Amino acid sequence: GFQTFEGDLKWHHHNITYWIQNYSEDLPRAVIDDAFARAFALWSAVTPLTFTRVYSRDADIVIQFGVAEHGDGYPFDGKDGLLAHAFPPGPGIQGDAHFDDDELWSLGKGVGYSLFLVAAHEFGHALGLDHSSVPEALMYPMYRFTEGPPLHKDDVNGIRHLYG
């Protein structure tokens, strides 16, 4: 099922920091903060890691909303298509998560994309999981909106393989 990145890339400290560098206008800031906090809460429960929001460009996981070419050479593509991408743990751009602001970001059913669910998938990459071949795993690479708990056994097995 689960996959890791070449060399089992992982964080080497337990207290992970994140910085929300900018905001989409799609949702109130506190709703965006909450969407990302809830996506981290999903991974903190099943790992020895903690996630603290800081205001610093030195944060481990830097979160951006961007359109088209947004600074890393992996451009976004307008509405639908590529939704978001994240880099595996490590320094600098590594571990960062970027969200295509040409998407309509929502919390709800079927009106564009759930920022909470997309962030939960991208944060799995930013902790060192790659794509799973197990259908219904959070890390299985297709978007389907769900009201159910997003983590599957295969995701939890993957993250336990990396962090214990």
Ligand X SMILES: Cc1cc(C#N)ccc1N1CCN(S(=O)(=O)N2CSC[C@@H]2C(=O)NO)CC1
Active site residues: 122
Q: Is 72 in the site for Zn ion (CB under 5 A)?
A: yes
Residues making contact with ligand X (CB under 6 A): 82-86, 117-118, 121-122, 125, 138, 140-143, 146, 150
Residues 105-164 that bind Ca ion (CB under 5 A): none
**Alpha-carbon span 132 to 125, nearest angstrom:** 11
**Alpha-carbon span 124 to 43, nearest angstrom:** 8
82 in a labelled binding site: yes
Closest distance between ligand X and the C-beta of residue 4, in Å? 15
Phi, psi values for residue 67, rounded to 5°: -125, 150
**Identified binder of Zn ion from the candidate list 87, 98, 115, 128, rule CB under 5 A:** 98
Number of residues that bind Zn ion (CB under 5 A): 2
Cα angle value 122/125/131 (rounded, 5°) = 100
Name residues whose C-beta falls within 8 Å of residue 64's C-beta, 6 or more positions apart in sequence. 21, 22, 70, 96, 97, 98, 99
Residue ranges of the binding site: 26, 60, 70, 72, 77-78, 80, 82, 85, 92, 94, 96, 98, 100-101, 103, 121, 125, 131
The residues that touch Zn ion, with contacts defined as CB under 5 A, are 72, 98
